[PDB]
Amino acid sequence: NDALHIGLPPFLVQANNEPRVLAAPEARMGYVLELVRANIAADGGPFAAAVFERDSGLLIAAGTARVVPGRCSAAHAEILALSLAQAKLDTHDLSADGLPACELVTSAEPCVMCFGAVIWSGVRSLVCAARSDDVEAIGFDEGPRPENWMGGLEARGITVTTGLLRDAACALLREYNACNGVIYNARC
Amino acid sequence: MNDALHIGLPPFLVQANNEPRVLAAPEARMGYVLELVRANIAADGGPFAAAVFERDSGLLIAAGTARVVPGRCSAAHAEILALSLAQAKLDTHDLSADGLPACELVTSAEPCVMCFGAVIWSGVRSLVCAARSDDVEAIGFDEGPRPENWMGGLEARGITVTTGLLRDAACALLREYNAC
Numbered sequence: 001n002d003a004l005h006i007g008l009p010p011f012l013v014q015a016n017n018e019p020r021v022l023a024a025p026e027a028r029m030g031y032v033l034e035l036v037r038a039n040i041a042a043d044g045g046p047f048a049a050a051v052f053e054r055d056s057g058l059l060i061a062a063g064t065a066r067v068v069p070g071r072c073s074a075a076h077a078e079i080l081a082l083s084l085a086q087a088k089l090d091t092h093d094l095s096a097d098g099l100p101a102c103e104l105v106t107s108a109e110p111c112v113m114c115f116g117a118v119i120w121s122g123v124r125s126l127v128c129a130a131r132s133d134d135v136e137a138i139g140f141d142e143g144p145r146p147e148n149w150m151g152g153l154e155a156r157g158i159t160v161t162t163g164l165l166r167d168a169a170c171a172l173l174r175e176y177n178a179c180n181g182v183i184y185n186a187r188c
Numbered sequence: 189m190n191d192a193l194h195i196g197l198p199p200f201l202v203q204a205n206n207e208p209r210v211l212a213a214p215e216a217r218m219g220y221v222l223e224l225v226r227a228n229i230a231a232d233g234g235p236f237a238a239a240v241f242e243r244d245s246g247l248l249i250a251a252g253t254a255r256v257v258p259g260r261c262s263a264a265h266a267e268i269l270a271l272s273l274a275q276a277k278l279d280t281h282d283l284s285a286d287g288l289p290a291c292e293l294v295t296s297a298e299p300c301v302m303c304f305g306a307v308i309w310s311g312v313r314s315l316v317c318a319a320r321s322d323d324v325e326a327i328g329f330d331e332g333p334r335p336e337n338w339m340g341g342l343e344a345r346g347i348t349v350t351t352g353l354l355r356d357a358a359c360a361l362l363r364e365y366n367a368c
């Protein structure tokens with residue numbers, strides 16, 4: 001017990017190693033939804049997120065839910081993405097002087113933990129696919145965020161957009177739920 | 189690292205996570221957590237520490253401190269480190285898993301909104317705090333927008349909350365830090 005060490009599965013190493021620029025919001029979210037499918041095939045939850053330079057679309061880092069495989073309840077996709085972006089740029093603050101403005105693109109609206117992390121991270125933009133109710137409907141709790149948490153973010157200069165590629169994101173939620181049972185199903 | 193999120197720990201904190209320690213009384217637990225605050229300040233970190241203990245025995249399971257700046261990670265609050273290292277040691281992402289003893293997070297101050305969430309997902313059954321939210325805010329650390337009645341929120345999820353335990357001793361270390 002010498003470090004907090006959350007191992008990344010190969011696909012997520014690959015994501016974090018390959019340079020990649022995606023200009024349009026849909027292109028960014030498209031990529032994030034590819035990572036959700038790959039994470040569900042690597043024994044993780046149906047959640048992914050990536051940090052992008054807001055104005056160039058350069059991918060800085062990506063993360064996925066590794067709570068179960070990584071034995072770590074803090075290892076939400078958003079935490080991983082934000083933290084790996086910080087390690088890559090060698091700073092705890094993604095708004096530090098001389099950094100480009102960063103945006104977090106996430107497959108679902110953040111839970112209350114991740115809401116706080118977004119606030120501390122220095123990102124200036126949050127872009128979500130699935131809504132909070134979508135996530136809760138398949139048994140993933142978002143927990144008690146403050147009243148008007150979106151407004152809370154905007155008051156901090158963090159822009160919020162939600163519902164982007166929401167249909168595809170919901171299809172991935174439903175796919176994970178249908179394959180999260182103990183009875184073997186070869187189609188899973 | 190290409191292949192992991194890795195937040196290294198300073199020597200005092202590695203030692204705290206790998207030395208046997210059983211602290212029965214709540215204040216003995218909190219006292220050790222305040223020792224960790226001081227050691228962390230001397231190791232270039234913020235004035236925050238926390239530890240996970242088996243609730244009834246007071247066996248220390250893991251400890252964490254603020255490593256935000258030297259770790260280049262805004263999520264590296266003392267509470268996130270303590271909860272995560274406890275889960276790693278007990279080989280589970282859920283500290284309420286069947287057959288595990290009830291776990292308690294003992295913290296130098298009341299949790300920020302992020303840590304409040306972390307506490308809810310961790311599986312701990314008890315939160316014990318020293319310094320108040322107002323005390324942390326009064327030396328320039330933001331707690332962020334937590335929901336109204338965040339304590340009732342934790343209690344409704346089966347997490348008993350205690351606050352103000354060795355508050356004054358904790359406040360002295362906060363004021364020392366602020367002043368330097």
Ligand SMILES: Nc1nc(O)c2[nH]nnc2n1
Pocket residue numbers: 045047048064065066067075076077078110111135140141142
């Ligand atoms: N609510 C929620 N729950 C999970 O398990 C997650 N993992 N990554 N983001 C997540 N969000």
Ligand SMILES: Nc1nc(O)c2[nH]nnc2n1
Pocket residue numbers: 234236237253254255256264265266267299300324329330331
């Ligand atoms: N509010 C707050 N701020 C920090 O920087 C911390 N580090 N550990 N707990 C913390 N809590």
Ligand SMILES: [Zn+2]
Pocket residue numbers: 076078110111112113114115
């Ligand atoms: Zn989350």
Ligand SMILES: [Zn+2]
Pocket residue numbers: 265267299300301302303304
């Ligand atoms: Zn915190």
